[PDB]
Amino acid sequence: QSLLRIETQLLLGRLLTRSGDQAWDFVVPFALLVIFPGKLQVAAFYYLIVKIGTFLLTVVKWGVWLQFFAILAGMVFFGMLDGLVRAGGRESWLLSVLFIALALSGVMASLGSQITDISVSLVAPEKLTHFNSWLRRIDLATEVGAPILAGALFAFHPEQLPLAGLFLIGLWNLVSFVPEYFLLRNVISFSDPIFWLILSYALLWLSVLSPHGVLLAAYLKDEMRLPETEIGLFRGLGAVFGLISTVSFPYLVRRLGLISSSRWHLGFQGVTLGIAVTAFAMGSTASVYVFLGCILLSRVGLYGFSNGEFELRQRLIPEGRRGELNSLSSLTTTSATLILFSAGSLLPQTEDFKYLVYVSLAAVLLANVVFIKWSSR
Ligand SMILES: O=C(O)CN(CCN(CC(=O)O)CC(=O)O)CC(=O)O
Ligand SMILES: [Ca+2]
Ligand code: NI
């Protein structure tokens, strides 16, 4: 139960790589709203380009080079985007060229994250169960750590420099490239009743009510005026509540069926998201705190259901019809976020983000109805 010399450099590489990746991706929606205040639409259009382009394009050594050039291009193009919009001449041909170039750096930034995760065959197949159990502590450390830290870097900026934190996050990402490289260099359908079980899981990917959702982050900062410090605290806590689901779900799976554990978890998610939406339409004084607090509670239900849906798939489809339904599972999940970010791209202003919250609760409640009806076989 001891990390090896090479196995430690693998762990130390995943930590440095993901910390820089996540911290930069957290502050990018904040930067896109600093530049374009009152237009969540533009931040949604940015990610729509990244989502599509990433899917299209998708070699292990190129990972750190791609992130380096991506963050480098992002800082140069974010600075140009900032200075040009601040001049006063809007909707130039030049304004579009910089944005699309900035969005092409987002595709490049995402490919580096995926490829560098591939590099994290080298661990002894006996010591792999201790290894794989450790990476979860590293991954958990970046989820809680980088949004919290990066939110403090973006929010505690000097007076006349709102994007002062963005470049500090990118300069971090560039300077860390020298550690990361040497570490990684050294050690490197039509008629199937189970289609409805997939579709119930898929609908939940249309909900914007996520602590790790970029659309919530833009709305929380722009319209609801939450500090990036408290938005990061929102994100880091959202990962901690999903951890609670790792105890709650095996415990209900013992005293109740695996179906009842998934049903009561997905039912819990819908209930707590319903409470959140009501307060979201209430006096915004202390109801924002309830709004975000109920989203945290709902993570236990969502992650509980995802473990059930995964386990139900593992026990229900035979190996012959397995990879095909995975193409279906991956399809519906892709289409949901595609629809999510396409619908958000059409928002006439940030304020009508409320109309995406409502469909989200509709989807979570609907996904509940579909699973309850399915689980009656
Ligand atoms: O929240 C987002 O930005 C988009 N999420 C939403 C899908 N979520 C479901 C949720 O958080 O409600 C997937 C998941 O992590 O379970 C996609 C992703 O995490 O890859
Ligand atoms: Ca990096
Ligand atoms: Ni999500």
Numbering used by the authors: 4 to 61, 76 to 137, 144 to 211, 238 to 426
From the paper:
To delineate the functional rationale for the Ca2+ dependence of Fpn, we obtained a new crystal form of BbFpn in the presence of CaCl2 and determined the structure at a resolution of 3.2 Å. The asymmetric unit consists of a single monomer comprised of 12 TM helices organized into two domains, as is typical of MFS transporters. The structure revealed an ion-binding site localized in the center of the N-terminal domain. We tentatively ascribed this site to Ca2+ based on the constituents of the crystallization condition, and hereafter refer to the structure as Ca2+-bound. All of the side-chain oxygen atoms, except for that of E203, are arranged on roughly the same plane along the membrane normal, whereas E203 forms an apparent bidentate coordination with Ca2+ from the intracellular side. Most prominently, the coordination of Ca2+ by N196 and E203 produces a distinct kink in the TM6 helix between these two residues, resulting in a marked displacement of E203—the carboxylate group is shifted by ∼5 Å. In the structure presented here, crystallized at pH 8, the presence of Ca2+ appears to be catalyzing the conformational change to the inward conformation. Upon examination of the Ca2+-bound BbFpn structure, we identified a proposed substrate-binding site in the C-terminal domain. However, this pocket was empty in the structures previously obtained for BbFpn. Unexpectedly, in the pocket of the new structure, we observed clear non-protein electron density, which we have unambiguously assigned to a Ni-EDTA complex carried through from the protein purification procedure. In the structure, the EDTA moiety is seated in a largely hydrophobic area formed by residues from TM7, TM10, TM11, and is hydrogen-bonded to the hydroxyl group of S256 and S259, carbonyl group of H261, and backbone amino groups of G262 and V263.
Ferroportin (Fpn) activity plays a central role in human iron homeostasis on both systemic and cellular levels. In vertebrates, Fpn is subject to post-translational regulation by the hormone hepcidin, a key event in iron pathophysiology. Hepcidin binds to active Fpn and signals the endocytosis and proteolysis of the Fpn–hepcidin complex when systemic iron levels are high. Detailing the nature of the Ca2+ dependence, we present the crystal structure of a Ca2+-bound BbFpn protein, which supports a model in which Ca2+ is a required cofactor that facilitates a conformational change critical to the transport cycle.
